[PDB]
Subunit: 430 residues, 4 copies
């Protein structure tokens, strides 16, 4: 057991810091003047372009697939540094990574060659999206006896026809609402969409994932793909994640990611478990910005007293708590991503670790931001400091990427209740 | 011991609910279009007008002084209903109340008659402000050997001359930056503002409070009173609490609230202790709105499952923790304001109880809003629900009205450390 | 709304204190030399004797029934004082109170007069016990489709025959294992005990409560009523709540408490709800002793430094948190018991308030004891201080009287989910 | 970065597990019958003998000093397995390790060769004790202008004379109150012990460590070393940490660990910093036993319902929270001991990491035990389950080894307040 960083991992850190400082710091002056969520998102376009130019999109795809991703620890380091400065654009990079994951993870060399090509070119501003989330929710999408996903697909000849609405998927409508360069649309198979999911068939057996590109949307009637809305979010105000409606939206059979059923579900599960671990790095980045801002302040400001406020035990107690949360969180992320890369561990083991990581790091990040504000006091509440932005951004994390209460705690509970559950396999082996 | 409400307490609730429902609900339409903090405050003026017309400003003044305040429990009931709906204007009323408290509490019948007049009239939109807070902080304003308040006063002839800066005080610049109708300016006495506070002099012995009206300001040179800025707040985006500079600002000696010294400090301390108790009702109002919005959702929405989400043990646990926090908070506030009104108890007992109240209610109000959001899930993060507003609003409370970490816990610690401290005196008697 | 105590409330406190100080302080010298739970329980007989002599058992029965209970606030005040000194004997009194509650609550004046008789006499050491808890658990005793209670009753001729086992009920085997002077044995009605509970009938319709006295036991074969064992408890080491087997145990039909079904369930529910509210006073008593011991220590000990440790912000912070938990807890208890006594309120309102109180008071009491230990430091871990006993004692409360996790949160959840739920009805009315 | 365990690390776990299960499980039958703290301690002697025989005392000493300790991660693994089963005897072993640390960390080969010898022999039941703590407290022992340690020392001829009292030090009296085989006695230097510490001199400059063996004690008058008492503890009921009084107790100058002053204080700090990191594994063992008992119960008991209670969200939530605390705790411990072993890092960086580790792991262990008890319910409260023992044992951890409130939070705060404080140096290197 070793925690030492390789030269390539310290370089990744240096590269991410340089990009965030020289590029991402200029973003706010552009997006802040815009009047709504989409406009703010479109204002980030030049910065994403610079991310592509800096090789950061290509770094979201494994080397075997023509990308430059060195490992998930490198990835975790990059994301922490990025989110400690500016989640605008940073969020777009990782949302694209997620949107690429089902293609990355499938075992279809032709699909990989064809659909990952734009993202490994180092050109343009291509966006990917994993379109899973829906207006009615998704915590219960696999509940046997329940309605299931409300975006459905049926096969008609050599094509699939998609019917229904998505809500929340990042980048899903692309820069201009004519679509992400690649969307992986997750559907429930239904020959007759006006009828309820069969309560006697396992929902996981009816899952399909269809690859939709801008070409696919262009080859369809205009009214077959409509953007109905764009949520105004409490924080991450520069992201896009619209409300989309599919109506008789035709997709070539060749665009079907794999055979419908447990394998399709598994691709979705694996993608979202990988994101569950990586989200920890984002949360640490945000909470670290908070902690660091409060630490610098506490060590340089006396608040009209005789000594720097760090010298008061209650203030120090808050900063200690912040520090501990960030330290424990990073260790857990690095544990989780390494666990996920370990070919000798069973899925159950990797999944459970990923669930722990998402739950802990996101819950604790919020406490860290809030405790940092309390320590600084009143001055943390005005927008000449980072905290108002950080407070809104940090509340995203426990809720998104499969919220802790409805999704991640349930996924974990399910593993723990299996007769063969081995709690310590990721540490002490089977 | 009795918890039953009188018909007048019930009417106070009804009256406050109706005002919030019929008047306050219309405020957002007006302030949401405005570009900055001051503009948003100005947009709020017609609603403070209606609050005056509804008698709510007169209700901030005791009956023996020409006001209509029935009791502090009536007050606590009104504040909860207002803040449950909309802190805009509601904050202005309560900030005015605090700005009036030093005059309400003094032993000067002539001063009371003169200065409370416009506030008990039922007319106009008159604003009051207790101007204590400062750019450098105030947590250590009473520390012997420290720099002390940086807003100072010296007597010259039959006038006092104020030098220095205030920051944060609600309403202080009035509607137009020409002054609150009444500001109580808290100063440290210094015949030479260039020299440090005497470290062998108890800071409390040097406190003066000077009454400043729009007339006082108009009778001074142009740049003797300057508004240097207006903080943009995370929440309560329609209040005004500017950065003010006094330069050789002359005030008549007749406007000095009382003899400078311990009695002046006493009036400030007492006003802030009353507001420490009342603030709990504000926190309750915000957190209650969060709880109720989450509760309705939970009992009407299945999130794509087969049952309402309140039927999941994890969801119910969150709503349970919310309800418990709200219930204990309200009991504590009523206990505290009732203790304040009890002539048999000595100040230190009333003070310790008010500190507890402020600390508890404001800390747990934050947790209540956060748990409500975790129970609702992703939907809580978009502005078509209240939570984004409530999250920014609730974080004000542990920070403002004397922060828990620097001020209130320290005030409580000091009382607990006294040799004759009686922990249960507010309950079981001395 | 009023918090002021009457002369009788103040006398009840004074009386409880004198009894705790003069009588209870001497119990430890007797029970400490004993070898097992029963030996320790039996060694407290002389102190329960004194409690009866001080009228404390008679005080558990309302005045219309020949007892001296003044109110539930008086009761809460009494219990707080007793448990702040010594839970031994104190626990026996309140367990007797619980045992008597179903009789006190029933609609039969002749049952009341016959069975309550020895408890209002002021002589002897009468013990009562509500025999509900079982070896297999009780959290799901009313679950439709579940196995239900495993102590069952069938009617044969003019008598009932009880089959099965109880575990935990305080006082159940009396001083000598020949039985409590009054036991209320809660049973699932089953004509054939070898058959499972019918999954098609609502469990609450099958509840019956049978009154079992030392007479009943003497009138049965020696092997019909067996004590299989006595749990060795972490804390409250002088109580008795043994493992009891009923085999073909015959009970007169006259000794049936009421009609089986909802009526009998209602009496059990009501009894346990009242105890849910009163348990708060016991938890406060224990936590108060912890807080006050830490407080006195903090104010008199420098821990080899230059100042009393209460002058360290981290120490004060712990003491402040303790104080707040205690204050909020007592407010909630007094609110709940008052709510229980208000005939204008629906049962579900009283139930929900009782549930909140049990959950909150018992959870935070544990935190209060631990923090007080943290503040005192290493010294708190040795048995020359109260803390070791208090720690073990305090951990009983979240678990017993219906655990927070399996029972009270579930009872509260059920109420919150009802369509006609009124969260604030106990405060603001229906 | 790597989390995989080596064959020897995996073997250290199997070995520690086998010893706990075959040996330590039998301890209870012997100590449970005794009537007081010392008797219960004395009843564990045969189990400590077996620990020695299994090479576990030798494993508390670095290889270069003739011991068998392979690394602090190995140590962490061992302690977690031991404490998961039985802290009796396990506590004696680690308390000995701490008592050995000042000698292990000193720069005197002759002193190490001589004093560490019985402990690496693989025979007997040798005990070591770091005698720092005192009746009046030690949170403030280094406070300038404060009273300081009340165990003082003065040099008279070629000897040192110790005056004052210790309280709490593990094993300090040995098995029979004739002394631990090696005690490291931490003293404040004072020529006239009736005079207060000079408020103008830095307390750290006055620290001395004097080695005191059974021979030392035998060479003194009887009344010069007396045990005044033995605390009855809430938990870890089989350990000894007596109240000791030194009255004109003579020690050879040859037994002075190093020159009094900052270097002597540094050895104490480093020793206690190392133990701050290792304590985390002790707390993990205790909390882990709680988690595992609750998990087994939750997955095989319906509590009179129609499904196992782990199938209830609120029960799962407690087990999840326990699991997460345990996982985060072990990562932190392993990070901390790895940091401590990193020659490229500054002391302040190592210390800060050790403080964090101690504060977090020990606070969170307590929550883990209590949550596991809440999930099991009423049954966890009776002594036919482990929890009553685990509850009392777990509360020791935030309190001992320098309590979190008075000591470890203050040591950490002090580091954070320095101008050159580097928060992420143990992770991202120094700039
Ligand atoms: C890598 C990282 C990056 C990320 C980004 C993403 C994520 N996640 N994005 C997205 C995408 O892309 N795609 C998609 O699809 N999506 C998305 N998102 C969204 C998210 O994911 C979320 O999380 C979802 O939507 C889900 O949600 P939730 O909340 O979790 O769920 P719901 O269904 O809605 O529910 C709610 C609630 O309820 C309750 N429950 C239910 N059920 C249940 C419950 N409990 C218990 N149990 C049961 N069964 C609970 O409470 C819950 O909470 C997104 C978003 C955003 C904002 C962004 C920015 C992005 C994104
Ligand atoms: C009842 C209702 C009413 C409300 C309104 C008001 C209030 N409060 N307003 C005002 C007025 O009116 N006036 C005045 O003057 N002011 C005001 N404000 C402000 C507030 O009050 C606040 O709170 C103040 O500013 C204070 O703050 P703080 O934070 O508390 O303090 P400082 O000084 O800043 O400090 C900070 C921090 O630091 C630390 N420390 C210091 N010192 C110390 C410490 N610790 C410990 N120890 C010591 N010694 C801590 O951490 C702290 O925290 C206001 C405001 C607003 C926003 C509004 C809206 C309003 C108002
Ligand atoms: C007023 C004051 C007085 C008191 C005393 C009494 C009480 N309470 N005692 C008694 C009597 O008397 N009687 C009877 O019967 N009993 C008794 N106890 C006992 C108690 O009450 C307890 O609490 C019972 O046992 C119950 O328990 P719990 O725990 O709650 O339940 P279970 O069934 O066992 O369960 C466990 C667990 O699991 C889980 N779960 C289940 N289920 C479920 C769940 N979760 C969710 N959901 C569902 N459904 C949970 O976690 C739980 O926890 C007693 C006792 C003692 C110790 C004493 C001293 C006394 C008494
Ligand atoms: C790993 C290994 C393990 C081993 C074991 C040991 C440890 N720890 N042991 C011992 C030895 O060996 N040695 C010695 O010396 N000792 C010992 N111990 C004891 C412990 O360590 C403890 O921790 C000590 O004592 C310390 O305590 P504390 O608590 O921390 O302190 P003090 O002084 O007492 O204090 C208390 C309190 O107070 C307060 N404060 C003060 N000061 C201050 C404060 N605050 C804030 N600030 C300031 N400045 C606080 O709150 C505190 O808490 C031992 C023990 C035991 C039981 C065992 C079993 C073992 C041992």
């Amino acid at each position: 057991v070793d925690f030492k960083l390789s030269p390539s991992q310290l370089e990744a850190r240096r590269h991410a810091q340089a990009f965030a400082n020289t590029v991402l710091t200029k973003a706010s002056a552009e997006y802040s003047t815009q009047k709504d969520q989409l406009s703010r998102f479109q204002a980030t376009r030049p910065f994403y372009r610079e991310a592509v130019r800096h090789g950061l999109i290509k770094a979201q795809v494994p080397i075997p697939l023509g990308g430059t991703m060195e490992s998930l620890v490198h990835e975790s380091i990059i994301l922490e540094e990025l989110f400690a400065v500016e989640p605008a654009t940073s969020i777009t990079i990782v949302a694209t990574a997620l949107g690429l994951m089902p293609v990355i993870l499938c075992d279809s060399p032709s699909l990989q060659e064809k659909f990952l090509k734009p993202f490994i070119s180092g050109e343009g501003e291509p966006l990917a999206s994993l379109m899973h989330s829906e207006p009615n929710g998704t915590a219960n999408w696999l509940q046997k006896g329940g309605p299931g996903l409300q975006t459905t697909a049926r096969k008609v000849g050599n094509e699939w026809v998609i019917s229904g609405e998505k809500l929340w998927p990042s980048n899903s409508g692309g820069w201009d609402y004519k679509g992400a360069d690649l969307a992986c649309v997750v559907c429930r198979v239904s020959d007759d969409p006006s009828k309820p999911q069969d309560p006697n068939v396992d929902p996981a057996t009816q899952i399909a994932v269809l690859l939709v590109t801008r070409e696919t949307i262009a080859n369809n009637k205009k009214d077959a793909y409509q953007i109905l809305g764009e949520p105004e979010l409490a924080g991450h105000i520069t992201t896009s994640g619209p409300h989309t409606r599919f109506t008789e939206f035709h997709v070539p059979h060749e665009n079907l990611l794999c055979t419908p059923g447990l394998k399709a579900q598994g691709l979705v599960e694996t993608a979202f478990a990988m994101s569950a671990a990586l989200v920890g790095a984002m949360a640490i980045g945000t909470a670290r910005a908070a902690f660091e801002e409060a630490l610098v302040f506490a060590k340089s400001d006396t608040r009209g007293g005789s000594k720097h406020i760090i010298e008061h035990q209650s203030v120090a107690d808050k900063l200690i708590d912040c520090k501990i949360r960030l330290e424990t969180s990073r260790l857990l992320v690095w544990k989780a991503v390494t666990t996920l890369e370990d070919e000798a561990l069973e899925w159950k083991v990797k999944l459970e670790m990923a669930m722990q990581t998402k739950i802990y790091t996101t819950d604790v990040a919020v406490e860290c931001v809030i405790d940092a504000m309390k320590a600084v006091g009143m001055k943390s509440y005005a927008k000449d400091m980072s905290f108002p932005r950080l407070l809104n951004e940090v509340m995203c994390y426990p809720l998104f990427d499969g919220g802790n209460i409805g999704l991640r705690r349930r996924q974990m509970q399910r593993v723990m209740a299996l007769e063969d559950y081995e709690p310590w396999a990721a540490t002490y082996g089977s």
